[PDB]
Amino acid sequence: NLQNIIYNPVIPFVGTIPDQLDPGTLIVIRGHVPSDADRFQVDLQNGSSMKPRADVAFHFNPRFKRAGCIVCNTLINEKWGREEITYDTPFKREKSFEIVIMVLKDKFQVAVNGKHTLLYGHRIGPEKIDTLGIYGKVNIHSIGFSFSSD
Amino acid sequence: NNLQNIIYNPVIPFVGTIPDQLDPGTLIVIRGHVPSDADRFQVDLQNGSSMKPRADVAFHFNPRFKRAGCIVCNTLINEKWGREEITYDTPFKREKSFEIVIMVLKDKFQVAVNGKHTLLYGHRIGPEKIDTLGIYGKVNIHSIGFSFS
Ligand SMILES: Cn1c(CO[C@@H]2C=CO[C@H](CO)[C@@H]2O)nc2ccc(C(=O)O)cc21
Ligand SMILES: Cn1c(CO[C@@H]2C=CO[C@H](CO)[C@@H]2O)nc2ccc(C(=O)O)cc21
Ligand SMILES: [Cl-]
């Protein structure tokens, strides 16, 4: 059921999500972490405004310093909320990944390389998300959606 | 037969509390038969048993018998049905007995009937929200039991 919006996008990438992230929707991101990566992020946004900065419903932010982690958060009116940090991180410098974001009624559920990674409760209604951004030190092979509505 | 909370010949419609959480690896095992004039029946994995307003249905598993038959899978959220996922390759048949095995995985349900893979259904509601098993419609249920993880 997977409809790729794009292959091998230049980073930073910002794209319109062509249908609503209804419960059951999957977002599938395939890529590779360069050997000098500090961090990258996948942001599910309410628009693409840079000034002022678009709200980020879901900021999914792998960080590579020390033993590494994933920081998840929400940006509302240009302010970050309570960080949810996952120390059990599957990402590594110079390794390839497949991220699967499952949109559920009340949360995102993220798996990497087929292994459960984390959950993130909705702080912004996911119906307000219409943009996907990927930023930072990361190589993206593909971004695709499997929409509920299809 | 190591199954847990096994009950026999429940009255239909059935609405029962699921006696533990639907963690990855959990099985729900339902044995029954389709009466000869069945239009449809359903197995609903619900978030409670509210009738008004109607309880969310994480997984509606709805065999239908008209024409070549099918299984309709859907989710009810805030009394609105989502996009139907229809399986046209259906193992169910009027006057035939069945064993349904619903395996809960982290990202989907995997359903087998009489030991044959039938369908997959991706989660739309977190399965931790499911506490109720409803069985409704034109069906006889011989037994229900569980395998918890
Ligand atoms: C660093 N950075 C940010 C801000 O990220 C925040 C910094 C710290 O904590 C926040 C989460 O709590 C968030 O990661 N937003 C960004 C967007 C793009 C880029 C970039 O490299 O192109 C870099 C970016
Ligand atoms: C017919 N029906 C429903 C509604 O089913 C919906 C109707 C059409 O499409 C939906 C799936 O998209 C769903 O089967 N909920 C029910 C609950 C119980 C019964 C009953 O026969 O007891 C019958 C019921
Ligand atoms: Cl949920």
Residue numbers in the entry:
A (entry chain A): 7 to 156
B (entry chain B): 6 to 154
Q: What wording appears in the published article?
A:
pmcGalectins are a family of proteins that bind β-d-galactopyranoside-containing glycoconjugates through their canonical carbohydrate recognition domains (CRDs). Galectin-8 is a divalent galectin found in the liver, the kidney, the cardiac muscle, the lung, and the brain. Galectin-8 is a carbohydrate-binding protein that plays a crucial role in tumor progression and metastasis, antibacterial autophagy, modulation of the immune system, and bone remodeling. However, there are major differences between the two CRDs, such as the presence of Arg45, Arg59, Tyr141, and Gln47 in the N-terminal CRD (galectin-8N) and the presence of Ser255, Asn257, and Asn348 in the C-terminal CRD (galectin-8C).
